Structure formats: structure tokens, C-alpha cells
């Protein structure tokens, strides 16, 4: 249906990506994701938001789900900005997925 | 797709409001 739906459906089948919970509200289409292999796992939520209409991706790191030791390992491997909530244009979603995937494999 | 909970609806708005914009991810 919506471009957003199409993008989500493909995102859920990316290598190394496991989508758990999905919802749609007024702001857009949101889903919880686990990414990464044995080396490291990161949980995060993506939002595909539409609000003359604007589209953006919201990235929310889910750190509460980690143990302290897992968080310490992740903080060595990933850039500081992946421990904060981010917005970025859809055209950067590929760059985001590649950065996350490479950072977890390091 | 699925109907949102109160927490999910709150979370969406809080996360949109507090998000830091980044244009791209790359190293030179």
C-alpha cells in the first residue's frame, strides 16, 4: 500500500534482522528490531513517520534490554550516536543498516 | 497493521520530539 509499508516489509527480511512487534499509529509505522549475530546483538525500534507531507526515519536504541556487560561491549564497537535517538531521511536507511551491521561484526 | 497501546502512542511522540537529526553515516 503505502511506500512506507513496502519499505518496512523489505526491511524485515534483511540479513541479520529480526522484527518482533509492529504497530501503526497516527505518527506512522513502527517496529521493534533485533539485529546482529553471535558477535553482538543490538535491539532498536524504527519509526517510519509521515506528518505537503514529510517522511523520515526515527531510530530508538533499546538499551534497557541489554545486560551491563553487553552494553559495555557494544559501546566499544558502535559509534556514540547509535546510543541516542536519531532522525534521518529514508535515503540514508541503507547507510544506517550497513553501519549497524558492520559495527556489530567488528 | 496492529492497534497501538497507550505506551506505544506515548513512545512515538516522545521519540519524534527528542530525536537528533543526522543526514548520513559515513567515515572519511
Residue numbers in the entry:
A (entry chain A): 68 to 118, 125 to 179
B (entry chain B): 40 to 67
Paper text:
Dsn1 Box 3 contains two serine residues (Sc Dsn1 S109 and S110) that are highly conserved throughout budding yeast. The high conservation and physical proximity of these serine residues to positively charged residues on Csm1 suggests that these residues may become phosphorylated, and that phosphorylation could reinforce the observed binding mode between Dsn1 Box 2-3 and Csm1. Indeed, mass spectrometry of Dsn1 purified from metaphase I-arrested cells showed that S109 and S110 are phosphorylated in vivo. Further supporting this idea, we could reconstitute a complex of Cg Csm169–181 and a minimised Cg Dsn1 Box 2-3 construct (residues 43–67) with both S66 and S67 (equivalent to Sc Dsn1 S109 and S110) mutated to aspartate to mimic phosphorylation (referred to as Cg Csm169–181:Dsn143-67DD). We determined a 1.8 Å-resolution structure of this complex, which closely agrees with both structures described above with the addition of a specific interaction between Dsn1 residue D66 and Csm1 K172. Consistent with the idea that phosphorylation of Dsn1 Box 3 promotes Csm1 binding, we found that Sc Dsn171–110 with the phosphomimetic S109D/S110D mutation showed increased binding to Sc Csm169–190 in vitro. A recent study has shown that Dsn1 Box 1 is dispensable for binding to Csm1 as measured by yeast two-hybrid assay, and our own biochemical reconstitutions reveal that the Box 2-3 region alone binds stably to Csm1, at least when the conserved Box 3 serine residues are mutated to aspartate. We hypothesise that sister kinetochore binding by the two Csm1 heads could trigger a switch in interaction mode between Box 1 and Box 2-3, with further stabilisation of the Box 2-3 interaction coming through phosphorylation of the two conserved serine residues in Box 3 (Sc Dsn1 S109 and S110).
